[PDB]
């Protein structure tokens, strides 16, 4: 709450910040995924040359673990998308709150002739 102009500046800045954070997190996660793909290529190129059945079983299990990590990554991305939608809804709700406050019938003041 506070002055309505304060409300206006806070809303505008928050909207811009939300959009910019969405874009930036998207880019950062993308180069993260590129790092992950390089790791996968390395793992396979090293798994082509195992020697004992226990070694190949162990590194197969390690590949399964990296797969689990990527699934965790997918969950995180869905979850960030849900958070983004939630905060967009919050920003719209704050806009609605300001708009209701300006127009509200609970107001009683009137500019007076002096």
């Amino acid at each position: 709450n506070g002055s309505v102009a304060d409300m206006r500046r806070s809303i505008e800045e928050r909207s811009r910040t939300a959009a910019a954070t969405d874009k930036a997190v998207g880019l950062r996660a993308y180069e993260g995924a590129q790092q992950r793909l390089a790791q996968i290529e390395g793992l396979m190129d090293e798994i082509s040359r195992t020697q004992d059945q226990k070694a190949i079983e162990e590194l197969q299990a390690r590949i399964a673990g990296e797969q689990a990590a990527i699934q965790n990554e997918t969950t995180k991305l869905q979850m960030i998308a849900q958070l983004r939608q939630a905060e967009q809804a919050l920003i719209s709700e704050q806009r609605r709150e300001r708009n209701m406050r300006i127009l509200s019938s609970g107001n009683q003041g009137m500019p007076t002739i002096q």
């Binding site: 708009n99 300006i102 127009l103 509200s104 019938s105 002739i113």
Partner: protein, 261 residues
Amino acid sequence: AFELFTPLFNKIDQTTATYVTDISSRAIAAITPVVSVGLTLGFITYGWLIIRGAVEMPVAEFLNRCLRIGIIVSIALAGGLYQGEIANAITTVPDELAASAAALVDQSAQQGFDRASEAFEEAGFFSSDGLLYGLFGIIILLATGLLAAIGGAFLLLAKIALALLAGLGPLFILALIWQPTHRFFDQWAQQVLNYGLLIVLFAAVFGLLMQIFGSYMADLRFDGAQNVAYAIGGSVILSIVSIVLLMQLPSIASGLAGGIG
């Protein structure tokens, strides 16, 4: 709450009334007593010279002196009762004719604009479909504004006219000692009668109309019981009817004042 008609009325009855009224009354209060002593000297010396000169004082001289003294004293007391009765009329005439004078108008406009504000609130709630209620509020606001403004403007013009006419009053009343200046006095008397009729008519009629509109529209509520289109149409009809009546009044008043003669 809605405090505009009473403060605007007060400010008008202060600024222009103060300037014109107090300038004229300060001049008259400054300049009468000297003129009155002079008039006494002039008449008593006239009667001294008629006693000691050519005969010019039959009962006729007493007659002429009596009527002229009557007129002069009437104009002087007219300046005094000008200050007093300007205050009294500005205070009482609308209030006495039809609490306070403009408080009824202010209350009715307060009800009207509260309903308009409720409509604006409902319009802002939806914010996507909430433009129909915005137009509802705008139409209601314009209706109440036009009605209240027509009434207040006619009242203000009538009171300003009375104030100016009374301010010139002493000069016009002193201005009937001859025949042509009497002819000029007649039109001032006609105008005073005209604007008195104007204040009476608008006081009574506009008080009635504002009371009716206030009751009607305070009864108005925006919920699921009353058809909003029906209520808004009713408010518009009442506003336009009152505007028509108030627009037809001034011609009636001026014509009647001319007809009296």
